[PDB]
Amino acid sequence: VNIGEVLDKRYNVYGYTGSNVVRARDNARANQEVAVKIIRNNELMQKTGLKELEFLKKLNDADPDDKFHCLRLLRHFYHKQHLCLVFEPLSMNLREVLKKYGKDVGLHIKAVRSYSQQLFLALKLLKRCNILHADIKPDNILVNESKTILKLCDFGSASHVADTPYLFSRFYRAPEIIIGKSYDYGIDMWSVGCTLYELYTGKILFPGKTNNHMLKLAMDLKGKMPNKMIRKGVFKDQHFDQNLNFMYIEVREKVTVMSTINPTKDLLADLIGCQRLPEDQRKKVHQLKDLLDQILMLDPAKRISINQALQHAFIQE
Amino acid sequence: YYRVNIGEVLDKRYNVYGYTGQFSNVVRARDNARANQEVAVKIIRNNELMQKTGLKELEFLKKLNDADPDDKFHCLRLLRHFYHKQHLCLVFEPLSMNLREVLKKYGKDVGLHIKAVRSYSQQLFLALKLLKRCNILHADIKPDNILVNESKTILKLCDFGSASHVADNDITPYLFSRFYRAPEIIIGKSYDYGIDMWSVGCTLYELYTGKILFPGKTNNHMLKLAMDLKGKMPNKMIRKGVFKDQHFDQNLNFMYIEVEREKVTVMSTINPTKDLLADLIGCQRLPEDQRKKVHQLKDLLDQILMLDPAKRISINQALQHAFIQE
Amino acid sequence: GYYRVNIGEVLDKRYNVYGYTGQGSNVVRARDNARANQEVAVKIIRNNELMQKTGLKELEFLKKLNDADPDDKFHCLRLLRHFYHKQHLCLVFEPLSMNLREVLKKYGKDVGLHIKAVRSYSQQLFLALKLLKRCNILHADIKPDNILVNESKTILKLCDFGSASHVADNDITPYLFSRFYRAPEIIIGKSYDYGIDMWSVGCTLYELYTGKILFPGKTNNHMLKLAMDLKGKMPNKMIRKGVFKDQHFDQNLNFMYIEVREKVTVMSTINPTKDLLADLIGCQRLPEDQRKKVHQLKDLLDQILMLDPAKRISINQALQHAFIQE
Amino acid sequence: YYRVNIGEVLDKRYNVYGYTNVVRARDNARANQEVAVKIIRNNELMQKTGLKELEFLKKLNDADPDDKFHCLRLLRHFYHKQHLCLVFEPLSMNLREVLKKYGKDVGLHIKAVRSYSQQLFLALKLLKRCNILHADIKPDNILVNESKTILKLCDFGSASHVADNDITPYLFSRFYRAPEIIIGKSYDYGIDMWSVGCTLYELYTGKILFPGKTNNHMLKLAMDLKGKMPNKMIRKGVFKDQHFDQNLNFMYIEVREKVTVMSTINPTKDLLADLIGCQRLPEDQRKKVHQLKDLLDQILMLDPAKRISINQALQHAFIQE
């Protein structure tokens, strides 16, 4: 991976981004900017490249007009036993935007409104194509030079609907994944909810040190997981006893058995954060609170649908 | 299971007005036939196993209740029973909450006053005494199966669904509640009233600290955690267990099994590392009277949590212990 | 078999006996040189068979009441610890050195206390009734002599748990305790409960305000007549439940007033003639605020001194009474 | 009935200090926080009405845990001598009393009516989310807080699941009765929209919109506003023969019954004139009254299917401008 080098007898590499992603000009297209993702030659990462290629192709093929905010794969090739995915050029990820523009205290509610709509449109396309992303978070969301259009990236995470709790990013992990319940598109809707709170506050919604702490924090917001849901979980015994008490595990392990968790998480107070806002922004923050309340239902089946999300006051009013 | 409705009348006299517990459903009712006096009603699940378990509970509560007519030995009072739509219904004295709820509401997840624990320990040892006098093993003593009055001053041992005659010796190592399970049950040794003494030991630590004493993921881990306190189980004890081969090798080394890929570490000894006094005291800076009682709780736990049931403090010795007497 | 106490003598290699308090068992004042010469009271129990058992019961009741109230909010004497000295049980108490009998002398000058002080003492005694009931204990001998006060006389503590029983013991005969404070259900031999302690407190509250015994009956029969001079004839349903009903009432449930050479007057009724208000006020003339409280004391005594225990104000209704609350 | 006395304590915590059978009480177990205790009459019918009220309020309260959709909060319940007692948030008075004391029998400020309208539509949105018909919405069953800024829908003794179809045409309050209930047509959330329509007019004018002496007269008064009920709607009515002939003429029954058979009813009810009244109003408020009238026009369509939706009502110029 060296600057000045040429890939596929056309891509002149002039920059790093941060597997490896480089910025290059296509000599065969009047030196138009591309991004090239070079995937490691090792056994696991190659088969993950094969999958990411197939998922992008299927999502690109299912959105020809590019209205549903997934990363555009231009083409692929091989350079010295290494798979290379050529992509539309893009500035940076929302993790970088939160640093530089958010200054670690989050973005303007207008920006979150716009980002919310685009991410909801991304879920719609993922559902249509029977795809779970499973690793949605600011780091896997790219933006253009002007920072107004986001594309969801990194589908090396991705799976078909029909297909474990340590696989992706703990903070954005849905409770049904943690307890080992059968899961659908709701896990991506959950991860989006976590992301929206983080885009406005700059902070992790559920900063749990373990899957156990994750369930505790989700229940600090919504109270104890419903018995009907706990029971459908293959890993219920790791978190709940035979009486369906929660086992709060602190790490040598100390365990506290709880009959109930009192809801204590004040989502509105954490979103506002003593800002003293004008009336128009205050209303949009209250509407984000309501949207989050509807997204972060512990039972997937009770979560706001993608269409109800796109129609939500926060995005529409 | 029976989904009972507010205002429904049971046995032509019990006006159901509330719910208490969702294993079995306990409802709050008023006795139309007895001045609207508060009762609790346990509706037993209708299957063959659960109704047989219910009739066993009925028998054991009657023996304990008849052996303690003046109600001094802290077992739940069964008033009477009836049948409603093929469900056995146990009518009980009106108790509101269990010590699990007390530990949440008044413990705030970090335990109760050492003096409250002292009084509760005395009350539980009196229940152990009644159980032994009637040749009964409870086999599932834990905060969830201990009820209290509204003031939380008096506790009643409840749920005789897991109970047996001392001689039934039919407790297999996967019955009941792992965290309160005595080492003799886990290795498949012959066992007695000692298993109830062990479970009370585990309960007392939890009442003071708010935390499980032995939070083992498995029976194997439960043995490890007990031996982290007392050192390796005695050879004479291992040899008497029909399940020794699941936990120990032919040399009587312990097999520490970490789980679905098993890792095994074979151990000649377990170094006593578990420090009960440091765990009980915790961060707290206590007045001298409380600090003394904690030290005495620790000595009592040391005498309760002997891995060999034959070496374990008796009920009478427990009641005569400095924690209880002084 | 009393114990010959000596000033300067040392008990349990730590208690410097410096003064006497009461002896009729022996209470002494001492300093604890093992704990900064801090003041304690030591009750030394008579070494005979009756008082040995009585001292052990007292010991058990104090531990239970003390345990049920760890922050000392419900006004019972604090037992610090106990020990044996020449085979005499010794109870070590927080250093109170005055009872309400002495306060009625020194500060009441035999004509009773300020109504505002009675109101405070009433709330404090109702809190002691609450703790006794929560622990299912009957004191059975509540009166000024068995109520201790701190040096400033702001705080009272119920003491002497030697007459005390479990609610179920049903063993209190009609000659056992202090005749003036003895409830009618005890006298007629009816089944009794916490009601008896509520009755004694009512008798005490009157005496705290007037300095005078409410019912100075020479006998159990005189006690019932004086009670009925306030409330009228005991209800029939109550007379019939009395094992000793034939000692006080004829087959027609007329009252037999025994004047003692025994003289007997058979009465179909008793006219309420006791004027509680007039006796509380008692030709005094008080500022308005005090006058209002005395009327409220009167209304509370009316609700406490119901002859049927099942009609008497509860402890919770007493604490919510206008006398306590307003 | 149970004659409850001042100073009495219910469930060993509720000190009854006042009348409103609904009573005012302080909860001795919750720092003397105020509550209202409804003591349900002790017979067969009222016990089941009370139990239905308990059930409908649990569901409604649980569906709206942040209390945004303006139904009465049921805190808990208990039995006192076999009377079901419902413990509610401690609300001041009903809109009937507000119309007397603050309205002076001639209605409320159009600003108040606008606020109240939005609050009632939010109550309709929740009732519909929970598949519940109130079936008795009127000023007497709407409560207000001490400042009269917040209304709550109360009295769910009349209520039913949308599917029940058990509401006969002599149930509930005649003046607020929807035409579909009167002709015995299958009905839905539309009957509560109708009752709100009727309430809004009464809240602004102080007067009953349709003060009909009988069900027949209620239909006549409604058709005085909108003309004869559509033929397709009449035919679907189980009781159509009590009010219309085989020719679908309306039979106007006047009471010694006399009957006038009418081919049509000419719309004569001037809703704008009635709302305006004697008043000369600032352009400010004249516009809000014109918008209320338009809103009332869209609510009071005789055909339930042609009525404004709850979302259309909330997004209506009357509320949003």
Ligand SMILES: NC(=O)c1cc2c(-c3ccc(C(=O)NCc4cccc(N)c4)s3)cccc2s1
């Ligand atoms: N993952 C993927 O599949 C893809 C990522 C990209 C990108 C990236 C933009 C920012 C990236 C990043 O790692 N920033 C974090 C960061 C952190 C600290 C410093 C700097 N310079 C950057 S990666 C651009 C175009 C196509 C793709 S496909």
Ligand SMILES: NC(=O)c1cc2c(-c3ccc(C(=O)NCc4cccc(N)c4)s3)cccc2s1
């Ligand atoms: N098992 C038995 O045999 C019996 C239990 C009872 C009880 C109970 C008191 C609290 C209970 C409980 O499940 N609390 C835990 C809990 C957990 C979570 C929520 C809530 N509300 C309560 S069950 C009361 C009266 C008689 C019996 S007999």
Ligand SMILES: NC(=O)c1cc2c(-c3ccc(C(=O)NCc4cccc(N)c4)s3)cccc2s1
């Ligand atoms: N009864 C008991 O169990 C206890 C009594 C006490 C006391 C007493 C305070 C004054 C007493 C007394 O007899 N005063 C009356 C009196 C009468 C005549 C003269 C003098 N000096 C005093 S006894 C103090 C501390 C602990 C206990 S335990």
Ligand SMILES: NC(=O)c1cc2c(-c3ccc(C(=O)NCc4cccc(N)c4)s3)cccc2s1
């Ligand atoms: N029905 C129900 O379910 C409920 C009614 C209420 C109320 C009431 C407020 C005023 C009422 C009333 O009858 N007003 C008429 C009026 C007018 C003039 C004088 C007096 N005393 C009364 S009833 C308050 C709190 C909870 C509930 S639940």
